[PDB]
Symmetry: none
Subunit: 486 residues, 4 copies
C-alpha cells in the first residue's frame, strides 16, 4: 500500500519554495542537504515518494530554476571518494552538471569553495568546465568565520569571494556531499546581491527529519536509524518553542549552528526573517502523507533493517557495536522488537530444526516461504525455488530442475574446481532453472515469477557471500542477516 | 553579592533525596555526577553556593549515608590522570576516601569496574587497597551491555559481579570522573539486592544543567560554555514533555541513553518509576535562587571567561577553533559580547598605546587598575603593585620596592642565569616586596592586601608563562588572556 | 616447472645435521620450529623442488626419533586470538595440529600451556578437554623478571614453577599455532628440567628463511623481505658471526637483537655457550641443497614482482596509502629488476591500449603467451581461458567451443530477469557453459581436460578482478597479478 | 677530558672535501645532512667537538664555498615546524651565514600558480638572493628515462653558482636537497662543466664498529623506527672491508647508483660509504674517552625517554628502544655514576634524593630538609665544595630566607615552605651583599656547565629551567612527588 501523495508534493513543495523567495524579496539561494536523484531511503520510508521526487518537484518550476554546484578545493586535491557511486568529488560534479542538463535544467555556475593555494589541479579543472560552458567562481577561506560578524559581512570577508552572476531568481545550491561550502556560498551570494541593490535571501531544503511530525514518529526515528553521528540526532527545536509555543523537530548540528546563522542573517538583511531553524526550512513532505499508518509501518520496518545492516557491517569489519547500539535505542523508542520483521523468526526456526543455515521470504501475497540447506541446494537457493513455485501456483512436491541441468555444474565444481561441497549457490540454481526452462513448463512458469520478488523482505541466519548478495540486489529484494558466518 | 540560598539548599536537597529512597522502597543507590569537593564553577556561577556545598548537604544526613567509590580498571592500565589535581585516577580514589573519612563519613567500599584478570596493575592496586582496610568488590565486562536485557539481568550479566556489602540505606556512588562505571555499579547493586529480598532503587544527582531553569537561562548557558562535547549540550527533555506536557532541561548523553536505561529499570524493579531523565534526577538547586539577577550576571561573566580559556588553550596546543567557536555560540544565545568583561578593553588600551603587553584587574570595590611593561617590571607584576597600593591606600607616587631588594635578583638573572631580559615576573616582585616589607612600612601594608585579590578578574593581552599563571592561581585570581605570545 | 632445489638431498642432509646437533649438545634437543609447517607455499615458489610440506617430510625420515610438542599461549584463549591464514581460533588450531601430526604417525603426547594462571577458567576448561583426547598437558607460568632479569629465571622463582613434560623421544620438536606462544621459553625450561634430572639437553632453532649462507642481496633472501609486512623481521648481516668467525652470514633483526640477552641465558642453563651467533644457534641446511642457483634466482625474482602488484591491489581495495608497495618496490631495485620482467605484463596492457577495454595474459607451461580481450560475449579473463585451453588441447583458434545452447540461458537470465545491461560472461559461467557444451561437442571436453595444466601459470590483468573471477583463478592454482585500476 | 681533535678536524675534513671535487672533475654539490649550527649531541659524544665545529670547518675554506638553501613547497602551507617554523628558518639561515662572511646568493624552490609562493620569490630578490625553480618529476626514483631528459631535469632552472664547491643545506629532512644536486650536475654536464655529488654527515661514523658506543649513541638519539645503523654490504662485497652506514641510505643506494651511472657516465661510487666524505672518526684522539662519553649519552637518552613517557602518558616504545641500545653497549643504568648515590639518599630519608658529579669527579649529594628541596641542597653543597668552603658553613642568612617563606605560607597559602632552586639562588644573592662566602659560592655557578645530575623524582618547570640556564645535564627517575 502507498501512503505518500507524490503529485500533491510536487505542487505543494514547489509552491512553498516560490512563496519563500517572494517573502525574502524576490530572489532565493536554496541549500539542498542530501541526495537529489537516488533517495532510496525516502522511497522505502514514504511509500509513493519516488527516489527522483525532489527533481520532479523542481521540474514543475524548471523555467524559474538555476542549478549551482559547489565543490571544496581540498576535495579536488585529496581526490575524495564518494562512497555511494564510487567516484571522486571532481567527477561527481561533472556527473551532476550533465544529468541536470539531460532533464533540461539550466546549469552555468560552479563555485569552488575554500580555495587556498590556487594550484595546478584546480587550474586544470577551471578550464575543463569553461569548455562545457559553465562559469566557475573562486571562493576563499573567510577570516573569522563563523564568529567575527564585522569581518564576515565586509569586503575583507565575503567580498573576497568572486560573485557568481546568476540569471534566475531561484538558485538551487547543491554539492557532491557535506563539507563543500554550500551554506557559505549561499550567504556570500546573498551579500553580493545586497551590494548590487538586489533583495535576496537564503533558505534550506531537507526531507529529513520532518519538522511537523513528532520526534517519536517512526518516520523521524527511521532517519535516526539511517544516521551515524550524534550530530544528526533529532531534538526539539527549542528556538521554535521559545518563539511560538509550538513543538517542532530539528537536529543537533543545525540547532547548535543556528545562533551564529541568525546573527549573520541579521547583518545581511537588517533583521532576521527566521526565529528558528524550523522557519529557515522549507520542507512540505510531512503535509503530503496521505496514509499515516502505512508510513508508520514502512519506517518501522526500515528501523529493523538498519539494525541488522549495522550488525552485519560490524561483524565484517570487526568494529565495536557503536552503530548497532544506536539502532537498538531507536527500536526501543519506536516500541518495536526485531521479531516484528516477520521473516526473522521463521528463518531462525529453520536453523533451529536443521542445525544448518536457514532462510525466509515474505511475498507480496503476505505468505512466508522458507528455505533450508540440503545436499543439492544452499538455503537461499532453496528459498528462491520454493517462492517461485508458490506464486506460480505449482504443487509443493513438483521438482523443477533437470538432472542434466545440475550435473555439468557439480562436475565442474568437484573435478575441475576442487570444491568439497557441491551445494549450488543462488546464481548456479537460476542458471540450472533457466536450462530446465528449455524443456519444462514448470521451470518457465517459475522463471517468469522472478520479477514479482521485487520489494520483498528476506532474512537469513548467516552472512551471505558476495554472489548471493549480488543476485538479491539485482532482483530488488531487501535482505537482513543474523551476524554469523558459516 | 549573594544570589543563592546555601542554607535552603542544604535543607531541601537532603530532604528530596530522603524522599526519593522512601518512594523507592527504603534503599537508594545515588549516582553523583560532577565534582563533589571543589566545584569552583558552581561557586562562581551561583554566588552563595560554596565549592563544598554538596558535601555540606550530605553532612545534614551524615549518619544515613555511605560512600562507595568506583574506578575503571582500564583507566589504571592507561595511567589516566585527573587534569584538575595532577594526580592519577588511582591516587584520586585514595584521596576521595581520605578526605571523606576526615569529614566523618563512612567509606569502606571500592568497586573496581571492567576488570579483566590479565590486568596486573589493577590487581596490584587491589592488595594496596586491602592493606588499608578497604573492601574491594570486582566488577566485570558485560557482553550485550546495554542492549541485551536478557543477558544483563541474569547470571551471565550482573550475576558475574561481586557485591558491595553496604551497611547504610543511602549509598552515595562516586568516582574520579566519567567512564568509571558508576551507573553500571548502581544497577548491579540493585540486581544483587533484589535477589536478597531487599527493595532497592536508582537515582541520579547532578547540579548542572538545572532541569527547572529555562534552556536560555545564563546559568544553564554557563554550563554549556564549561563543556567540550556535543554529548553534554543542553536539550529539551522530550520524554518529559511527551509524558507530562512540561518543558524541562536535560542533555544529549542522558537523553540518548534513557530508553535502554528505562527498560533496564523495569526488568530490575518490576515497573519503571521514571518516565523521563528529569524524573530520574534529584537536583533542587534551581529552587534555591534567592536573586535571579546576581546569578545571571555571575554566569554571563563565566561564559566570557570560558570563551577566553578556549581561545588560549587552542593557541598553546595548535588545535582548531571548534571549542572557542562553541563558546561564541553560547555568547550569542546569552546575547553578550566579549567586551562585557570590564577588564578586557583597559588591558588592550595599555598595549595599543605602548606597543608592549598590557594587563588589568577589577577590585572588589569595582575599580579598574592596569599594569604596563617597563624596564624593571612585567605588566602583571606592575599591575599587582598598583592594585596593592590602591587597596592599602598608598599614594600613587610612592615606590614600595627598595633597590636593595631588586638588585640581587637582577644580578642573578643577567650575570649567572645569562638571560638578556632583566624585568621581573610576579613571583620575584612579590619576593622583592616581602624583602622590602622588613624595613619599609608601605611594603608591609601592600603585602597585607594580597588577601583581598581573591576572586578578582584579570585580563592580559599576552599569554602568561607557567610561573605567573601559578601565582595568580594561588591568589585566587580569575585570569583571561588574548590568544597571542610575547 | 624447472627444478632448482634438491629435495631428496635436503631430506637426507637436514635430518643428519639436526641429529648431529643433539649429539654435540649431549643427547637431547629442543628444536624451535617457527613459520609455516605444512603449507609453505612461498618456499615452493622460491625454491622450485621444495614441497609445501618439505619440513615435515624431512622429519618423516627420522619420525621414530621425533616427538612433537605443541605450545599455546593461555592468554590467547580469553582474547580468542584467531589464525588469519585459515579462519579458526588458536585453541582449535592446537587440536588441528595434533591430529594432522598423528595422521603421519608422529608421536604427539605433550601440550604446554605457557602464561597459565589460576584466574583463567576457559584455560582450565581446555586442560580437561585435552586430557580426554589422550595427551599429557604441562602447566607453564609467567615469570616477573623475564627476560631482562637473569637472577629470578634460572633457579626456582622462574623455571622451577614450570611443569616438566616427560618426553619419550630424544628429539623434541617445539611447535605453536603462531608467533608469541612462548615456544622459546618452553625450550629453555625443559633443558633446565632435564639438567636437574641428569640428562644433557640443548636448544636449537629451525628457520628456513632467511638462508644464512646466501648473501644479503641474493634474490632468495630478497624475496622473503618482499614477503614481510613487519619491519622487525628485516634481513641483516649477522655481525656476531662476522666478529667471531670472520664469515659473512645472513640473519634478521629480531633474533640479532635478542641474541645478546639470550647468550647469557644459555650459559646459565648449560655451562658454556655453544653458540657465538644466531647463525650458530640455527640448523638450516636448505642453502646447501640448491641444485640450480639460476632457477632459484629467477623464481624468487618473479615472486618479488608478484608481491609488488599484490600490495598495490590491496592498497587499491582498502583505500590506504602506498606503504607496503613502495617497500616492495625497493627490494625490486635491490634485485635489479622491474615490473616488465614478469613476462605477462606488457602483453596484457598492449591489449588494453589497442582496444580501450580491460586486457589479460597467461604464460603456459610450454612458455607461450596467450592473451585475451574484452568482447561482447566474454570478459577478458574468460576470453584468455578459452584461448589458453584451445592452445593446450591443440584445437584450432577459429573453432568456437561455446555452444549457443549453453550461452543462451545464461544470457537470457542476466538480461530479462536479473535486469543487467551487462550481458558479459565471467569465468565461472563460461566454465559452466563449457561444461554443458561438453555433452554434444567433444571439443569442449578436450578443453576441460587441460584446466589441470594451469596450476603454476602466471596471469596479469589490467583491471582489478572481482571476487568470482579471483575465486576461480585460485581454485585453478593460477598466480594472478593486477594493475591497481578499476573498469 | 678531550677525545676529539678540533683543529685537526677543521683541516682534514675541509681538505678531504677539496680532494673529492678534484676526483670528480672540478665542481662539487655537497649534501649536508643534519645539524650544522649548535650540534650539542656531537659535543657530548665526541669530547672536544664544539657545537659549531662544522661551521668552523667550512670557515677555513670560506673563499672556495657557496651556501645553497633548499625548501620544499609543501613545508610552507602546513606551517611545518622544529623547536619557530620552516617559514622564517630560511630567512634565519641566510642572514646568520653572512655574519661570518659566507657567500649566500642561491635558494632552490623544490616541488605553479601559487599565491604565497610567488610572493616568497619577491621576498628573496628584494633582500638579495637569486632563486631557482624545481618541479615534481613523474616517477621520482624508478623512471630513469623521464629523469635524465627534458621531461624531468630539463624542466628545472639552473642555479648560476659562482664557486666550485656548493654546500647544499636545508631547514630539515625531506627538502629534496639530494634531488637538487643531481639536477645541478645534469645542467652543468650539458654546459660542458664536469660536476659531481657527495654526502656529508657526522653520524654514524663509517670507520668505527657497528656496536661502537658512538654509533650506538646516534641510534639512541632518533625517534624513527627505520633509522638503524647497518653494515654497508655494498662496501663489503666490493672492497672486502667492514663499514657502517644506516638503513635509509643503504635502502636508497641501488636507485641512486643507476641515477649516478647516467648523470656521470661511469659510476663514481660503489657504496654509501664511498658516497660519503666524513673524517670525524679519523680525528678521534682518545677512543676510550669517546667510548665513555657516548655511553653516558645513551644513558641520558633512556632517562629522558622515561621522563617524557611519564609526563605525556605515552606507551614505553622509545624507552624500550634505548634500553636495547644500553644492552648493545653492555651498560647498565647504574653506570651513570650519580644514579645510585641519589637513590641511596631516597632509600634512607624516604624523601626525594639528589646527586651531582663535579668536573673534579667528586660526587656531591642533596637531601630533602624542612628548609630546602634536595636540588637546592645539592646546589649549595656543590657550590661550597667548589669554592673551597667548609661544609658546616651556613651561607644563607636568616633574613634572606624568612621573607620568602613568609610569602609562601602566610600570603600564598602553601602547606610546604621549602625552597626551590630559583628561591635558594635569590637568597644566596641577597646573602652575597653582606657575606663573602655567599659571593664566593655564586662565583662557582659557571663551573657547573657539563655536569651530570640525577634526581629521584621528576623536576618541576621552575627547577628544570634553572638547570638548563646553568648547562647542567639532568636525568630523573620516572616518579612524581607525593601530593
Amino acid at each position: 500500500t502507498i501512503g505518500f501523495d507524490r503529485e500533491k508534493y510536487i505542487e505543494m513543495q514547489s509552491q512553498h519554495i516560490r512563496e519563500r523567495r517572494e517573502a525574502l524579496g524576490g530572489k532565493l539561494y536554496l541549500e539542498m542537504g542530501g541526495k537529489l536523484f537516488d533517495d532510496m531511503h525516502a522511497s522505502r520510508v514514504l511509500p509513493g515518494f519516488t527516489p527522483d521526487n525532489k527533481i520532479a518537484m523542481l521540474d514543475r518550476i524548471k523555467d524559474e530554476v538555476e542549478i549551482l554546484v559547489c565543490i571544496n578545493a581540498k576535495d579536488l586535491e585529496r581526490h575524495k571518494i564518494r562512497a555511494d557511486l564510487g567516484i571522486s568529488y571532481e567527477e561527481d560534479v561533472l556527473r551532476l552538471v550533465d544529468v541536470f542538463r539531460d532533464r533540461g535544467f539550466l546549469v552555468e555556475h560552479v563555485v569552488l569553495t575554500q580555495l587556498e593555494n590556487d594550484n595546478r589541479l584546480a587550474l586544470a579543472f577551471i578550464e575543463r568546465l569553461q569548455r562545457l560552458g559553465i562559469k566557475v567562481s573562486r571562493h576563499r577561506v573567510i577570516p573569522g568565520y563563523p564568529t567575527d560578524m564585522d569581518r564576515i559581512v565586509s569586503d575583507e570577508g565575503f567580498g573576497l569571494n568572486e560573485y557568481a552572476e546568476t540569471t534566475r531568481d531561484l538558485v538551487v545550491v547543491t554539492a557532491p556531499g557535506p563539507g563543500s561550502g554550500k551554506l557559505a556560498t549561499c550567504l556570500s551570494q546573498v551579500y553580493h546581491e545586497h551590494k548590487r541593490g538586489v533583495a535576496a535571501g537564503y533558505a534550506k531544503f531537507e526531507t529529513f527529519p520532518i519538522w511537523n511530525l513528532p520526534l517519536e514518529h517512526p518516520v523521524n526515528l527511521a532517519y535516526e536509524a539511517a544516521t551515524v553521528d550524534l550530530n544528526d540526532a533529532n531534538v526539539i527545536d527549542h528556538f521554535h518553542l521559545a518563539a511560538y509555543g509550538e513543538q517542532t523537530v530539528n537536529y543537533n548540528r543545525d540547532v547548535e549552528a543556528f545562533p551564529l546563522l541568525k546573527t549573520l542573517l541579521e547583518r545581511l538583511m537588517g533583521e532576521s526573517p527566521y526565529q528558528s531553524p524550523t522557519d529557515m526550512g522549507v520542507n512540505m513532505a510531512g503535509n503530503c502523507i496521505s496514509d499515516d499508518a502505512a508510513c508508520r509501518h514502512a519506517s518501522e520496518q526500515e528501523i529493523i533493517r538498519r539494525y541488522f545492516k549495522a550488525l552485519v557491517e560490524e561483524a565484517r569489519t570487526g568494529k565495536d557495536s557503536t552503530q548497532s547500539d544506536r539502532a537498538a535505542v531507536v527500536m526501543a523508542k519506536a516500541g518495536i522488537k526485531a521479531s516484528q520483521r516477520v521473516v526473522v523468526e521463521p528463518a531462525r526456526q529453520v536453523e533451529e530444526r536443521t542445525s544448518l543455515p536457514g532462510c525466509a521470504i515474505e511475498l507480496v501475497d503476505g505468505s512466508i516461504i522458507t528455505g533450508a540447506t540440503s545436499d543439492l541446494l544452499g538455503c537461499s537457493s532453496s528459498m528462491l525455488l520454493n517462492a517461485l513455485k508458490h506464486l506460480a501456483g505449482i504443487d509443493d512436491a513438483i521438482h523443477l530442475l533437470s538432472p542434466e541441468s545440475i550435473e555439468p555444474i557439480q562436475t565442474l565444481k568437484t573435478v575441475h574446481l576442487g570444491s568439497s561441497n557441491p551445494r549450488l549457490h543462488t546464481d548456479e540454481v537460476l542458471i540450472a532453472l533457466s536450462v530446465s526452462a528449455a524443456t519444462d513448463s514448470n521451470a518457465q512458469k517459475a522463471l517468469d515469477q522472478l520479477k514479482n520478488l521485487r520489494g520483498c523482505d528476506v532474512h537469513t541466519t548467516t552472512i551471505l557471500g558476495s554472489v548471493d548478495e549480488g543476485i538479491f540486489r539485482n532482483l530488488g529484494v531487501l535482505v537482513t542477516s543474523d551476524p554469523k558466518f558459516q
